[PDB]
Paper text:
MOSC proteins play a key role in the Moco-dependent reduction of N-hydroxylated mutagens or prodrugs as a final electron transfer enzyme in the nitrogen-reducing system. To provide insights into the catalytic mechanism of MOSC enzymes, we report two crystal structures of YiiM, one from Gram-positive Geobacillus stearothermophilus (gsYiiM) and the other from Gram-negative E. coli (ecYiiM). Based on the comparative analyses of structural and biophysical data, we present the common and distinct features of YiiM enzymes and propose the putative catalytic site that is located at a reactive invariant cysteine residue. Sequences corresponding to the β-barrel and N-α-bundle modules of YiiM are conserved in MOSC family members, suggesting that the two modules form the canonical structure of the MOSC domain.
Although the crystal structure of the TP1000-expressed ecYiiM protein was solved by molecular replacement and refined to 2.85 Å resolution, the electron density for Moco was not visible and instead a phosphate ion was identified. Interestingly, in the ecYiiMPi structure, a phosphate ion was found in the cavity of ecYiiM near the invariant cysteine residue, C120. The phosphate ion in the ecYiiMPi structure appeared to be captured from crystallization solution containing ammonium dihydrogen phosphate. The phosphate ion in the ecYiiMPi structure is stabilized by multiple hydrogen bonds with the side chains of cavity residues (Q115, S118, S200, and W201) and partially fills the cavity, leaving space for the remaining atoms of the Moco molecule in the putative catalytic site. However, the phosphate ion in the cavity serves as a guide to locate a Moco molecule in the YiiM structure because Moco contains a phosphate group at one end. The ecYiiMPi and apo-ecYiiM structures are essentially identical, with root-mean-square deviation (RMSD) values of 0.35–0.47 Å. ecYiiM exhibits a similar overall structure to gsYiiM but with significant local structural differences (RMSD 1.20–1.24 Å). ecYiiM possesses shorter β1 and β2 strands than gsYiiM. Moreover, ecYiiM contains an additional β-strand (β3s), which functions as a lid on the β-barrel along with the β3 and β9 strands. ecYiiM is also characterized by an additional C-terminal α-helix, α7, which folds back to the N-α-bundle. Consistently, the asymmetric unit of the ecYiiMPi crystal contained two ecYiiM chains, which are related by non-crystallographic two-fold symmetry. In each interface, the α5 and α6 helices of the C-α-bundle from one subunit make contacts with one side (β8′-β7′-β6′-β10′) of the β-barrel from the other subunit.
Author numbering:
A (entry chain A): 0 to 10, 25 to 42, 52 to 224
B (entry chain B): 0 to 10, 25 to 42, 52 to 223
Write the structure that this text describes.
């Protein structure tokens, strides 16, 4: 039963107190995307990649609510349920990188790079609202799937069209509504949707 | 491909024009329970069970939005995705019987009996909003699970405590938030929640 200590941030500013996790997110901050998570470890990577702006790559530069060390996309699975203090949360999707990040860091291809590396983080849906805190760690209570956030990112963005793999992703407990809609549409249309608008803003 | 004709009803009155299906349900009518489905076959059963009120047991007596013939809880699966006209919908849970039905039929134990038989029908979540109609059938496009609605009802209500079977249910694609919360809580608490308040008041 590993515990992952969490640094919390809301509208973005570090929080030390006890606070309330509602169905719609933490107080002061849709239901499938109420909580953003980014692995603190990835900052080291970005800093190496862009030395002359290493000072920009610290939490919560990527807009995250939860910052941790020891959880990454390859050891966190779709549908995973974690207890956090009094609340329950479930992994709903990988976070899709967005062009707005490029302007936030004033680096032209960050979003593209995030997507390519798969160092994107994940969003939660809140299964039970409750009292939470910075001093209360995450604890995995149910793993109900075999698809790691990493694999979900790969199915989404790295692989050529594979109906079988979309079927697999659609079978993942907790999958967000948008990702269900996106993947189902691929299966029916036979086409992978455009990423350009999301990634560049052009 | 097998496609299922459907009678629609919106709060209940039979609609047969086109109408818009939204994230929050049909136009005129939470996101996990936007669409209620009940199999038309069950009415025959209820009529036999309560002969002196057989006239009450016709669609949409059980409040359903969708009425069909050929789909039942043993051949519909958790997480199933169906195309309906222009929209996409996903099976999210068995419908939980409620005491209000007892007053609707003015028969004292209908909800309890529904739960016990497992003749409960199911709710959908709306994956894509779109134009729908009575003249547009349901078509199964993705089956992503091995838990039938029947099995989910049994895990819920018919079985003694079985952590393994709750794990199984928590692994079902599309499972509603409330059922996820309910089943997770069983696993942590070691206790099956009370049904009485829901079944009676």
């Amino acid at each position: 039963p590993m515990r992952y200590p969490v640094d919390v941030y809301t509208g973005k500013i570090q929080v030390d107190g006890e606070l309330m996790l509602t169905e719609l997110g933490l107080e002061g901050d849709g239901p499938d995307r109420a909580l953003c998570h980014y692995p603190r470890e990835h900052y080291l990577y970005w800093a190496r990649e862009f030395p002359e702006q290493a000072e920009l790559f610290v939490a919560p530069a990527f807009g995250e609510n939860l910052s941790t060390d020891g959880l990454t996309e390859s050891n966190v699975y779709m549908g995973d349920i974690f207890r956090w203090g009094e609340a329950l949360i479930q992994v709903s999707q990988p976070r899709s990188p967005c062009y707005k990040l490029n302007y936030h860091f004033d680096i032209s291809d960050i979003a593209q790079l995030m997507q390519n590396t798969g160092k994107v983080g994940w969003l939660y849906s809140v299964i039970a609202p409750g009292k939470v805190s910075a001093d209360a760690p995450l604890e995995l209570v149910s793993r109900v799937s075999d698809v790691t956030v990493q694999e979900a990112a790969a199915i989404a963005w790295h692989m050529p069209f594979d109906d079988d793999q979309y079927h697999r992703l659609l079978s993942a407990a907790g999958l967000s509504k948008s990702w269900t809609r996106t993947m189902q549409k691929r299966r029916l249309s036979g086409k992978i949707e455009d990423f350009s608008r999301r990634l560049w803003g052009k």
